[PDB]
UniProtKB/Swiss-Prot annotation, chain A:
Species for this entry: Homo sapiens
Note: Although strongly related to RNA-specific endonuclease proteins, it lacks the HXHXDH motif that binds zinc and participates in the catalytic center. Its function as endonuclease is therefore unsure.
Function, as annotated: Component of the integrator complex, a multiprotein complex that terminates RNA polymerase II (Pol II) transcription in the promoter-proximal region of genes.
Sequence similarity: Belongs to the metallo-beta-lactamase superfamily. RNA-metabolizing metallo-beta-lactamase-like family. INTS9 subfamily.
Subunit structure: Component of the Integrator complex, composed of core subunits INTS1, INTS2, INTS3, INTS4, INTS5, INTS6, INTS7, INTS8, INTS9/RC74, INTS10, INTS11/CPSF3L, INTS12, INTS13, INTS14 and INTS15. The core complex associates with protein phosphatase 2A subunits PPP2CA and PPP2R1A, to form the Integrator-PP2A (INTAC) complex. INTS9 is part of the RNA endonuclease subcomplex, composed of INTS4, INTS9, INTS11 and inositol hexakisphosphate (InsP6). Interacts with WDR73; interaction is required for the assembly of the RNA endonuclease subcomplex in the cytoplasm.
Gene: INTS9
Lineage: Eukaryota, Metazoa, Chordata, Craniata, Vertebrata
Protein name: Integrator complex subunit 9
Subcellular location: Nucleus; Cytoplasm
From Swiss-Prot, chain B:
Domain of life (superkingdom): Eukaryota
Signal peptide: none
Species of the source: Homo sapiens (Human)
Annotated family: Belongs to the Integrator subunit 4 family.
Crosslinked residue numbers (Glycyl lysine isopeptide (Lys-Gly) (interchain with G-Cter in SUMO1)): K184
Function in brief: Component of the integrator complex, a multiprotein complex that terminates RNA polymerase II (Pol II) transcription in the promoter-proximal region of genes.
Subunit structure: Component of the Integrator complex, composed of core subunits INTS1, INTS2, INTS3, INTS4, INTS5, INTS6, INTS7, INTS8, INTS9/RC74, INTS10, INTS11/CPSF3L, INTS12, INTS13, INTS14 and INTS15. The core complex associates with protein phosphatase 2A subunits PPP2CA and PPP2R1A, to form the Integrator-PP2A (INTAC) complex. INTS4 is part of the RNA endonuclease subcomplex, composed of INTS4, INTS9, INTS11 and inositol hexakisphosphate (InsP6). Interacts with BRAT1; interaction is required for the assembly of the RNA endonuclease subcomplex.
Protein name, as recorded: Integrator complex subunit 4
Coiled-coil zones: none
Range of the intact protein held here: 608 to 961 of 963
Placement of covalent cross-link Glycyl lysine isopeptide (Lys-Gly) (interchain with G-Cter in SUMO2): K184
Protein's cellular compartments: Nucleus; Cytoplasm
Swiss-Prot record, chain C:
UniProt keywords, alphabetically: Chromosome, Cytoplasm, DNA damage, Nucleus, Phosphoprotein
Subunit structure: Component of the Integrator complex, composed of core subunits INTS1, INTS2, INTS3, INTS4, INTS5, INTS6, INTS7, INTS8, INTS9/RC74, INTS10, INTS11/CPSF3L, INTS12, INTS13, INTS14 and INTS15. The core complex associates with protein phosphatase 2A subunits PPP2CA and PPP2R1A, to form the Integrator-PP2A (INTAC) complex. Interacts with NABP2.
Cystine connections: none
This protein's record includes keyword Nucleus: yes
Pfam families to which the protein is assigned, alphabetical: INTS7_C, INTS7_HB, INTS7_N
A GO cellular component entry from the record: nucleus
InterPro entries xref list: ARM-type_fold, INTS7, INTS7_C, INTS7_HB, INTS7_N
Main subcellular location of this protein, as a coarse class: nucleus
Source domain of life: Eukaryota
Keyword flag Oxidoreductase: no
Protein name, UniProt field: Integrator complex subunit 7
Sequence positions bearing Phosphoserine: S768
Amino acid sequence: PSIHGDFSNDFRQPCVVFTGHPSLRFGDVVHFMELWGKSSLNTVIFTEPDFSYLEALAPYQPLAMKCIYCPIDTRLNFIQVSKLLKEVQPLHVV
Amino acid sequence: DPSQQFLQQSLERVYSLQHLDPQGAQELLEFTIRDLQRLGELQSELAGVADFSATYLRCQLLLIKALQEKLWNVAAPLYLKQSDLASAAAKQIMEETYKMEFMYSGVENKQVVIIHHMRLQAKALQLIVTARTTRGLDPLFGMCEKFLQEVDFFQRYFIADLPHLQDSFVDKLLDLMPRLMTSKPAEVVKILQTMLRQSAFLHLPLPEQIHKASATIIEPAGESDNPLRFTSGLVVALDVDATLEHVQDPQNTVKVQVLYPDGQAQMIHPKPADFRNPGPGRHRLITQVYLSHTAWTEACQVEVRLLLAYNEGTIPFSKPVKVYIMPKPA
Amino acid sequence: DANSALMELDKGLRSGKLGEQCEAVVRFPRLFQKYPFPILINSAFLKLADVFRVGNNFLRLCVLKVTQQSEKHLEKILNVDEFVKRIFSVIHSNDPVARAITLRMLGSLASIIPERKNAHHSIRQSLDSHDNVEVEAAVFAAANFSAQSKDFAVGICNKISEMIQGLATPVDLKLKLIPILQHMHHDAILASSARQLLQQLVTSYPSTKMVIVSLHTFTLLAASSLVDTPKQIQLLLQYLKNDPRKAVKRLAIQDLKLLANKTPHTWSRENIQALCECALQTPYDSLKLGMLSVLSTLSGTIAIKHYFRSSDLVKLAQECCYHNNRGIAAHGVRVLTNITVSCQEKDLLALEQDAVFGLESLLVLCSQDDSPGAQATLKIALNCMVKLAKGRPHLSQSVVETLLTQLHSAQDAARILMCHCLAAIAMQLPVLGDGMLGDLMELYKVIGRSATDKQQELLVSLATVIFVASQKALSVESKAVIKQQLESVSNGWTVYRIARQASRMGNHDMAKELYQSLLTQVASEHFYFWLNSLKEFSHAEQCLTGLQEENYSSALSCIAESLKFYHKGIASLTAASTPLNPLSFQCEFVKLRIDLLQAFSQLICTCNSLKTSPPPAIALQRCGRISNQMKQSMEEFRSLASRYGDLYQASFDADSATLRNVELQQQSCLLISHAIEALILDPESASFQEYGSTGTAHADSEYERRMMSVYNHVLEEVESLNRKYTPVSYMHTACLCNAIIALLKVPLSFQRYFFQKLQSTSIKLALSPPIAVQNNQQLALKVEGVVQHGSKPGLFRKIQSVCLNVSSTLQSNMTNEMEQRVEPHNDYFSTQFLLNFAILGTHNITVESSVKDANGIVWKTGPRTTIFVKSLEDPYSQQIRLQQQQ
């Protein structure tokens, strides 16, 4: 439920940690960025596309910790929406 | 109640004998301060007003002690800081006026104008001594104009209270405020110091009901060892509970401060939801607080302490409780 | 060890023969002092409570003695409930002695376990018991618990009232039962109820013992509960005047003296008038003495100011000042002295001469009989003489004149005391030197054949007052003094103390004469070096006696001659140092005098170089060499002032006079540096007005008086020459050289801390101990220390802070600036520091310990402690750093 509950005692270092908010402006992810930001062997991996990733790392910008922008959006892309629209055939589109 | 009568008679005793020799005046001051502290210890009802009046009397005692020091007889080049008591006196009275204004409840405008007047006297003493220690003219002009602006801000704030400050220090400053800006700063220092020496001692009208705010940390409790074990860098929780008595707006004024064993003083503003009010006049501050650091050679203790913040600028409020911490490397 | 000793004591406990058990039990508190470890204390007290429960009454008595002696270690008891539970079980024993020892045990434990209600019930039930020992033990325990618990006090006050008012309670038990009531100071209504009970006691039980006990405990209760103090005072005065018994009156006097000692400000004019009426009315001189002691105690405080021309107090003090009895006269004239030195009304002018002639009469009365009571009265009168000559300085000529006319006829002890008084008076005003000096000198002749015991101390005191009187050089007089010493003293300790006083008053030629005589008869080499160094310093200071105003060549010659002997002396004094008593203050004080005289020599040389090295063809500037050397002299004198300042700060144990003397040295250095600046370097921007309130310059010595006079003269001379001349004129040189010569003319005055160390203190400063540490795992340090003390801790200065400052450096910069101020709270402070060594080199740790006294003054006194810490990273972190560095 949090860092301090039992994660503060059961945590071993080479690890993968899914937490906080993808905005990087609150949550446990903020503390983790402040923790592992200094090193270069670590890395942050982004998945949520609704936040501009270059804006998310901006307040922690002079950091050596590798950042990966690999969004995993699964919404309808434009070719799928084109096929969908041509199948359904609505009189109008808004 | 003879306790109230004793309090009032002690206060009029020190007020009526303001004409004494500074040695005798100091003796009366500290006698009354000891009496008022003991009175606060005896009866819990009058502990607030005893502490209030005792703090004001301590301010006057420190001012009197500073003004009669052997620092005005010698000239400016022969000034020494090692034997200086007046700078320490000025800082102490400044802090005490803050404490008097904000910690105690039930303060009306007359108490506030008395406290602000004593604060102004403190600022004047600090200006005098800092003029004594320096020779460049830029610092004198700077803090002298800031102090005269402070006097103007005072007398503007308290126009209604001015006809009651009779023979007061501010009454003597108002006789010369339009003309003091004309004179050279050394003469301004001379005149304000001299007329500060013979300034009257202001009566402090007591409120009908008044208490000193108090906080009692109970949940950390500083019991013993078996420190808080947590991994380095990560966070260790610390549940904090305190009983706060006679505070008006704790959720906008009470700040939790922690002191790691270094310069860091991480200050926390708890949310207004954790300030409960189970009974009238007493609160409950049931707050979780978070601490963190890197690995330490062995366990050490962090001093967590309540603070009280006023409109910025803050004061200590409670007894600092230490809690041991054991950051183990991961 | 701890455990070994505890095991041995338990073995003694199980021994089953009473002797070894008692031995072990009474051996327990010494073990507590040896090893104050709370686990040991808790386990040991558990064993003690267990042997208390099962064991005959004598063993329980030994355990009670232990608990009474080990009251402080009771605070370190954790298993309080179990301990008390097994102590408390023996209250059910039918044996009343066992119950009595148990009640006394609970009374001894009232501090740690008040509000234990079953214990309260045991006190209450045992109070009305039949066995006398059980009732007394219950009374004692009730006293302790009433002192501790408010609930117990309010619960037991009614029982005590009904017990006194009960009729089956005998008189002696009532007497023991009354002073429980002095512990009813927890509450206002509680105190008021107790006061009502005590009034009922004095009215209904008017026997001398019971009124004494009741009105004395009522006094203590009103003393603690401050609301009842005025009615207590008026009750005591009423009993003093009305009750005819001398014992009751004596108690009224003694406890009014107690009240006047603790709350004099609460005394009213009516109370003082009533007491004065009592004193005038009484025919018994013992009572008159007692309430006059009370009056003198009041008059010492502000109560006289509250009391106020002519009045019953003044009539009393005039009447009693000439009393036949010496004690009444002494107290009455002390009252007169206090009133005279307090107020400045126009009727008091007639009162002062009355006081003076009263002091005269006391000198005629008390200076012959040599009784110890005569010594007490003489000390009172002489302290009064000193007081009203210091407080009313226009009245000191007559004081000294009667002291002179009486010094001829007084006995030896009276001569010692009057010489001390005269020395104080002479130190406080300098305008009476040569005349009274001649009279004390013609007195000095007849001291060789006075007695055998007080002769030495009389010689010391008389030579001291001779030196205070003198302010110049004496040759035939010094010959007479030296001849007297060789003829009659032949001791050296008297000669050494006389030479000490000669150094203190600045009479250095005859001090050199005495110190030189003492080299032969000393036994240890350290003292030989010390006495030789004192001889050289005294000779060096006397070299400056030959200075002359407006003769700078003679000034250079005299300063060089002084510096030669000063250098010989400082070498000898550094030879006098030892691991024990290292002459730190003396070394540093003499070294700063060395540097000051060398700076003066350099300044005079430069002032002469103004004309001995004219400027070049350069078209401040145009006087380049003289300006640069003026600047160097300015820097030197400022550094000298700073070194006098840190010497002051390192002098935490010194008396006030020594600190003022060092402060005067610093001020002379600052005066010379400021004169240099305002005359040569920065005259334009030094527009400072010397508007200091010089009237209140209360000089504490003739030496300090000359120091302030020469400061004032140099400063006003500088002020008169602020912008008059170009900054390299010969008048600037004349001003600076005259300042130097006038500063040197007043001779140096060594002080007490140079010769005599009191109130020593130091810090052991233990801390966690070529030390490696992982860079990531930043250092956690524990620093702790005890404050040592020589005799009484708080003689001059009180210590409540330790401002431990700690820093760090690399390649043994200033990376770990941090400090903590800790109150020791048991003369032992302990705190922790966290230190970062992210740099992978070696860091040296320097930790200091300054002290903030009660007034807020910081004294760099504590030891400078240094350790070396090796910082490094683990090989895995180092290896990943190397991989990641490229």
